[PDB]
Amino acid sequence: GQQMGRTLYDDDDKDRWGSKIVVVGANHAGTACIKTMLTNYGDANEIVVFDQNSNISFLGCGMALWIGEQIAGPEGLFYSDKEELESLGAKVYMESPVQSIDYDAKTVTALVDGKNHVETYDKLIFATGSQPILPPIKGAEIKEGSLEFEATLENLQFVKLYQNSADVIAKLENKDIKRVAVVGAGYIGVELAEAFQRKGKEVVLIDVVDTCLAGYYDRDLTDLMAKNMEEHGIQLAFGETVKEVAGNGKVEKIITDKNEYDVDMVILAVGFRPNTTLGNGKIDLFRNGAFLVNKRQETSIPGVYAIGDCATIYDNATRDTNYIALASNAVRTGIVAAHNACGTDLEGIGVQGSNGISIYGLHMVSTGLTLEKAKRLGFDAAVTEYTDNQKPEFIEHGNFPVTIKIVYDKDSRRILGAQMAAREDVSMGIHMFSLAIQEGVTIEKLALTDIFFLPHFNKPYNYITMAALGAKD
Amino acid sequence: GQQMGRTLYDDDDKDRWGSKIVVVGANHAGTACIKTMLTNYGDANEIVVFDQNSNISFLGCGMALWIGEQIAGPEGLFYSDKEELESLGAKVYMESPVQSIDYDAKTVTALVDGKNHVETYDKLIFATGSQPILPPIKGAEIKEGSLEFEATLENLQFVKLYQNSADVIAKLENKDIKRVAVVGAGYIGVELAEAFQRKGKEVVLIDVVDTCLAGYYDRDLTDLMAKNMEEHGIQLAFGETVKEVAGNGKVEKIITDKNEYDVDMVILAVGFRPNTTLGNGKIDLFRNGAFLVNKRQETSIPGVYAIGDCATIYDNATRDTNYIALASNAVRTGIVAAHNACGTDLEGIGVQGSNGISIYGLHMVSTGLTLEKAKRLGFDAAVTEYTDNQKPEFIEHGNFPVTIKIVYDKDSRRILGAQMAAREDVSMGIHMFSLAIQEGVTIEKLALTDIFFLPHFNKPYNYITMAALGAKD
Numbered sequence: 054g055q056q057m058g059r060t061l062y063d064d065d066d067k068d069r070w071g072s073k074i075v076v077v078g079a080n081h082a083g084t085a086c087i088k089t090m091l092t093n094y095g096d097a098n099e100i101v102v103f104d105q106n107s108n109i110s111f112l113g114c115g116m117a118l119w120i121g122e123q124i125a126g127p128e129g130l131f132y133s134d135k136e137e138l139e140s141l142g143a144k145v146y147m148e149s150p151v152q153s154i155d156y157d158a159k160t161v162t163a164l165v166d167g168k169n170h171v172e173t174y175d176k177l178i179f180a181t182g183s184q185p186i187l188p189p190i191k192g193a194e195i196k197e198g199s200l201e202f203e204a205t206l207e208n209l210q211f212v213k214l215y216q217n218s219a220d221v222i223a224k225l226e227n228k229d230i231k232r233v234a235v236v237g238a239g240y241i242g243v244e245l246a247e248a249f250q251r252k253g254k255e256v257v258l259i260d261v262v263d264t265c266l267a268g269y270y271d272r273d274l275t276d277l278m279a280k281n282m283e284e285h286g287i288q289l290a291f292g293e294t295v296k297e298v299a300g301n302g303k304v305e306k307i308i309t310d311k312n313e314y315d316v317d318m319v320i321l322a323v324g325f326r327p328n329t330t331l332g333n334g335k336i337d338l339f340r341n342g343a344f345l346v347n348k349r350q351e352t353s354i355p356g357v358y359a360i361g362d363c364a365t366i367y368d369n370a371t372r373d374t375n376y377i378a379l380a381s382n383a384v385r386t387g388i389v390a391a392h393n394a395c396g397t398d399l400e401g402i403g404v405q406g407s408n409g410i411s412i413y414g415l416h417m418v419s420t421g422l423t424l425e426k427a428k429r430l431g432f433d434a435a436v437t438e439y440t441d442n443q444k445p446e447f448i449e450h451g452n453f454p455v456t457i458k459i460v461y462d463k464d465s466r467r468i469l470g471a472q473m474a475a476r477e478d479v480s481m482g483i484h485m486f487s488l489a490i491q492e493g494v495t496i497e498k499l500a501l502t503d504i505f506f507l508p509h510f511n512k513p514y515n516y517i518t519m520a521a522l523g524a525k526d
Numbered sequence: 527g528q529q530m531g532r533t534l535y536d537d538d539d540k541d542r543w544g545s546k547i548v549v550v551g552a553n554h555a556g557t558a559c560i561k562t563m564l565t566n567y568g569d570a571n572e573i574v575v576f577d578q579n580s581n582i583s584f585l586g587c588g589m590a591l592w593i594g595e596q597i598a599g600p601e602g603l604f605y606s607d608k609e610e611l612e613s614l615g616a617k618v619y620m621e622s623p624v625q626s627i628d629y630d631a632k633t634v635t636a637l638v639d640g641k642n643h644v645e646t647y648d649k650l651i652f653a654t655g656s657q658p659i660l661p662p663i664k665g666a667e668i669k670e671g672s673l674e675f676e677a678t679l680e681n682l683q684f685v686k687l688y689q690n691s692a693d694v695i696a697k698l699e700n701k702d703i704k705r706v707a708v709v710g711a712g713y714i715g716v717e718l719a720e721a722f723q724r725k726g727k728e729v730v731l732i733d734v735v736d737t738c739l740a741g742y743y744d745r746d747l748t749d750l751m752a753k754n755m756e757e758h759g760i761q762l763a764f765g766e767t768v769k770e771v772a773g774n775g776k777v778e779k780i781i782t783d784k785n786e787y788d789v790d791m792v793i794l795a796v797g798f799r800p801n802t803t804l805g806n807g808k809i810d811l812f813r814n815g816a817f818l819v820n821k822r823q824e825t826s827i828p829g830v831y832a833i834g835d836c837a838t839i840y841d842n843a844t845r846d847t848n849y850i851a852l853a854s855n856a857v858r859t860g861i862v863a864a865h866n867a868c869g870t871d872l873e874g875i876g877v878q879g880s881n882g883i884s885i886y887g888l889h890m891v892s893t894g895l896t897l898e899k900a901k902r903l904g905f906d907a908a909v910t911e912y913t914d915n916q917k918p919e920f921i922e923h924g925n926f927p928v929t930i931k932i933v934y935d936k937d938s939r940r941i942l943g944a945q946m947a948a949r950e951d952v953s954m955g956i957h958m959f960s961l962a963i964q965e966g967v968t969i970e971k972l973a974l975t976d977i978f979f980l981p982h983f984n985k986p987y988n989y990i991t992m993a994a995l996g997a998k999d
């Protein structure tokens with residue numbers, strides 16, 4: 054549950070046409086868009102929703118917690134449903150994939166109960182998200198026709214939809230599954246590795262890249278996380294390319310660039326691809342296939358918008374259009390699209406790719422660009438870091454050390470990103486840095502920023518101030 | 527212990543004049559200023575320091591922790607000393623009050639070892655701080671000539687200097703002291719009320735204002751803290767003006783315009799007033815007597831600076847000159863004065879009066895203006911608040927409710943202040959708001975800010991985002 058009334062953007066209907074709005078996809082992005090449109094303009098527009106899945110408004114972000122038994126069950130993993138959306142005024146078509154769009158006639162055709170259902174629209178909103186990518190691996194193939202990404206080989210898994218996590222959790226039941234291999238060391242793979250380990254399985258995390266969380270944290274923090282997993286029994290196999298998943302009728306072994314591992318299950322957490330084929334080429338696309346949208350989430354075709362993982366978003370850190378597949382962006386782009394499609398001019402403000410991760414008590418957060426990625430992208434970047442206790446040394450209890458990294462542009466002086474890591478939750482602190490980047494705050498201005506002082510909470514010369522003052526480049 | 531090398535503001539000596547710089551006062555403001563000057567420009571300048579007290583670089587902020595025995599005595603309540611400052615290159619005179627300044631001959635006269643000592647300067651920096659506020663109360667006077675705020679009536683106490691708390695602790699010895707009255711319900715009085723209660727004494731918190739923490743939090747949260755104190759036996763006597771402290775040779779009773787209370791000790795924690803007598807009418811002063819300074823901390827007399835509690839500061843919440851007596855500000859203004867005094871053009875950026883308080887496990891933070899205060903200043907302000915749990919309902923442990931309030935200008939839409947309260951540490955969250963106020967971010971823009979999402983840390987529709995979206999005015 055997470056509802057409210059009109060947003061502060063909602064404004065008088067005045068003299069705008071009433072619009073019939075078709076929404077394709079109803080997970081994070083679609084649900085946020087639909088709720089915003091109905092709770093704000095309600096009766097003024099006709100909202101029709103289509104989703105090919107048998108369930109919607111699912112919290113995929115909580116699958117690892119469920120698999121790792123960090124939560125009782127799947128109950129709280131849904132933030133809405135067909136009934137709730139309908140109670141807001143929407144017409145919802147479940148298990149009805151939209152299969153074609155006619156932009157001239159302005160209709161979409163979906164398969165409703167095995168029959169072609171044609172639906173007219175004034176505004177069209179794409180919230181189709183993305184699909185898991187299958188790398189070229191011998192023995193890894195998808196059973197054609199499954200909108201659920203089912204592999205032909207038994208115990209070879211993908212983890213994106215609710216069914217996937219349920220399917221995995223089910224199989225984790227039989228004692229036959231003792232060893233699990235997780236392919237891909239991004240945040241999803243890392244979370245999954247912990248989950249299987251927590252379930253008591255022998256885990257091996259494999260990736261062709263030389264470390265985990267690459268592109269999100271700099272070397273010393275990825276090393277720290279890596280050490281964190283190893284000290285919990287997770288075997289790391291970085292710098293290795295998976296060549297094959299073999300076995301007689303089921304997964305029994307995973308073969309890589311330089312090794313072979315006996316495993317009873319393989320999870321592929323390599324990446325996703327935007328679902329933008331319905332564009333039929335009529336819409337401008339980003340290089341990865343994402344619908345290219347402006348700050349109002351509008352595509353190159355007037356009246357048609359795109360939100361969430363199926364579209365781009367403006368990145369204030371890099372200051373260029375980008376593609377950041379996060380539930381956080383899904384919600385905000387959905388809200389922006391909602392208002393614009395309903396006649397309210399609302400321009401988005403871009404994002405910083407802010408994110409957090411928590412594995413075995415090690416908490417980390419980052420926003421913007423790591424030093425590595427900044428340099429890799431042609432920024433004359435530098436990093437200023439500091440490690441110090443959260444509170445004054447005289448505090449007898451509840452203290453802990455924190456490591457902060459602030460990446461800034463040596464030239465323009467603007468802050469490009471920041472990372473924080475500690476054994477206690479200081480995630481709230483990254484919000485300031487997300488805002489800093491958004492607003493173009495420089496490392497010099499940050500250094501003097503009003504950071505309050507209270508002995509029980511922090512030090513007079515807190516690590517943010519110390520790091521900023523210590524900028525040497 | 528918060529030392530560091532050069533700041534990011536330091537720059538090549540180029541063709542600048544080094545100079546003789548005299549610093550009057552060496553607590554928070556003076557120490558930070560002295561260190562910035564000696565560490566960044568060391569050799570090029572001659573620094574001489576005068577301080578009328580027998581101890582410098584004290585963390586008065588921890589006296590309540592000290593008194594209430596939450597920490598091991600004054601152990602770590604000092605961030606520097608005479609030896610450290612001299613080793614850095616400064617000449618330090620302890621127990622040497624500066625009794626007059628000759629702005630014409632540009633020289634100061636101090637009492638060193640009971641004899642006048644003149645010192646010439648090219649630059650003068652006032653870090654004389656503040657003194658306790660002492661309204662008209664019969665029986666309450668500071669002994670003539672004491673530079674330690676010693677009351678003439680036995681057991682009547684002020685709490686500002688190291689000796690002041692050692693003195694209170696000394697008095698707390700004899701079991702005869704059973705009841706203590708704390709006059710002033712701001713954060714200091716509230717912290718002291720808890721300290722005396724932890725020491726097992728009966729406490730009565732008296733204030734002319736109808737509530738505690740007036741001007742820091744809105745009635746909503748001050749009620750929370752009031753009930754929090756009462757749940758520990760502290761008696762609240764708000765809406766009462768103390769008229770007299772009486773007794774036969776010592777404190778025995780405190781009288782207000784509404785009641786009379788039988789007490790064995792009285793602590794006056796009404797507030798701070800700028801200590802600017804040395805101005806001699808030659809320097810422009812703020813409405814409260816503070817040295818009126820610009821963004822460079824420079825007074826109306828060129829070459830003369832004022833920092834910390836004896837000077838004003840720019841408030842980005844009210845967008846005007848103000849007086850905010852905080853250690854955080856003392857340190858920042860000292861750094862700015864240091865650089866400018868040494869030839870480096872450094873323009874201050876103002877503050878938001880950010881602050882925090884933690885009593886009996888109730889943690890609160892605020893920055894900028896409260897709705898009441900904003901209105902008291904003529905702002906056509908509004909507030910948008912939200913209360914919800916920090917994390918999703920499915921989180922087994924570590925979850926807790928948080929209440930947030932965001933005050934904004936209905937006209938300009940800029941954020942004027944924010945407050946947060948919870949029984950778990952969410953204090954890092956106020957930093958984003960402090961920055962938002964500094965940058966003049968609007969409520970509309972804040973609602974779309976990129977706030978990351980991780981189930982272990984927060985909710986997709988977190989309370990910051992929800993509060994902003996809920997702006998009604």
Ligand SMILES: Cc1cc2nc3c(=O)[nH]c(=O)nc-3n(C[C@H](O)[C@H](O)[C@H](O)COP(=O)(O)OP(=O)(O)OC[C@H]3O[C@@H](n4cnc5c(N)ncnc54)[C@H](O)[C@@H]3O)c2cc1C
Pocket residue numbers: 077078079080081082083103104105106108109113114115116117149150151152180181182183184212213241328331360361362363378379380381382383978979980981
């Ligand atoms: C294991 C895991 C953990 C994650 N953790 C986090 C995290 O902690 N924090 C964070 O910010 N993000 C996280 N994410 C990313 C986040 O889940 C995605 O960014 C978000 O789900 C995208 O939402 P969406 O609505 O854009 O797309 P999707 O969730 O991909 O949904 C698209 C929807 O549209 C439907 N659809 C597609 N095509 C059609 C069609 N042709 N016709 C009808 N319907 C269609 C689909 O059935 C689906 O319901 C995580 C992802 C995974 C897999």
Ligand SMILES: Cc1cc2nc3c(=O)[nH]c(=O)nc-3n(C[C@H](O)[C@H](O)[C@H](O)COP(=O)(O)OP(=O)(O)OC[C@H]3O[C@@H](n4cnc5c(N)ncnc54)[C@H](O)[C@@H]3O)c2cc1C
Pocket residue numbers: 505506507508550551552553554555556576577578579582586587588589590622623624625653654655656657685686714801804833834835836851852853854855856
């Ligand atoms: C109980 C208490 C709790 C507090 N808690 C917090 C908190 O949690 N967070 C926060 O930000 N702030 C807090 N403060 C406020 C903070 O302590 C002040 O803002 C800060 O001390 C001001 O520093 P300063 O150097 O400007 O002045 P002061 O501390 O007043 O020092 C001025 C110095 O100059 C010397 N001096 C004065 N006149 C002369 C003279 N004529 N000749 C020679 N020397 C002279 C004095 O001896 C003194 O050492 C608290 C204050 C108190 C009393």
